[PDB]
Amino acid sequence: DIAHNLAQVRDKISAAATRCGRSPEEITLLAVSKTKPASAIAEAIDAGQRQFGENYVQEGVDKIRHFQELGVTGLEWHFIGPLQSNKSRLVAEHFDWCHTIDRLRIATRLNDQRPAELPPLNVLIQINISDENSKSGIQLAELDELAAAVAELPRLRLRGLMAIPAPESEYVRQFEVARQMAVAFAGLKTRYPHIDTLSLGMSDDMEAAIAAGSTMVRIGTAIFGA
Numbered sequence: 001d002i003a004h005n006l007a008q009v010r011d012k013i014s015a016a017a018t019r020c021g022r023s024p025e026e027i028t029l030l031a032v033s034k035t036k037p038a039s040a041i042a043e044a045i046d047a048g049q050r051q052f053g054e055n056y057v058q059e060g061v062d063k064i065r066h067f068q069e070l071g072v073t074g075l076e077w078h079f080i081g082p083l084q085s086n087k088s089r090l091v092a093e094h095f096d097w098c099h100t101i102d103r104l105r106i107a108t109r110l111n112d113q114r115p116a117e118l119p120p121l122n123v124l125i126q127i128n129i130s131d132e133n134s135k136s137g138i139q140l141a142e143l144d145e146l147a148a149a150v151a152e153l154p155r156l157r158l159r160g161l162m163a164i165p166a167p168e169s170e171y172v173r174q175f176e177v178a179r180q181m182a183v184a185f186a187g188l189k190t191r192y193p194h195i196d197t198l199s200l201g202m203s204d205d206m207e208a209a210i211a212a213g214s215t216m217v218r219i220g221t222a223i224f225g226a
């Protein structure tokens, strides 16, 4: 039951926030609906969920159109998969957020392809904080430079950072890696305007991520099923 699952996940987020002295409202639940049908997203919407994350462009855009045409309003769609230049127009025309900016050229493409009547596309810079097996994300040493360049693009709005840490079973290392991201996030916050989003944490490291300073957790299977 998606409604029951959503409630359970929200309770876990709230508990984790309250335990470490944070307000539950500080944490956004991003429901990750990749590979799940529109009907499952519709159940989540009926249960009050408004923020959805998609990883594949055409799948995501088809869903966005489906709910637009149904006359559902108030939804927020986040693109959280790797972006390729040949699919960027679709992201720029339909999504509200993109978490996966890891090079300047793709940001400039999105900027140039974003219609002026839409709000600026909210973007996060993706850091490869700990994953030797991933080619997504920049090194922290490259952040100052990329952030400055992306920040000038008028049809984007730089809102913070994202990371997908390497899988980690130890809580200590979950927390330590998440803190590296929180420190970088805090640093950006001190000089850049409207830095308020740290997209960090999934089901298995949710508590460590929240304790470290995440503002947004990305949950799929625990809401929608395997």
Ligand SMILES: *Cc1c(COP(=O)(O)O)cnc(C)c1O
Pocket (backbone or CB within 6 Å): 032, 034, 055, 080, 081, 164, 202, 203, 218, 219, 220, 221, 222
């Ligand atoms: C798939 C995915 C998730 C959700 O993972 P689950 O195992 O289904 O909870 C979260 N964030 C990103 C970027 C993903 O690709």
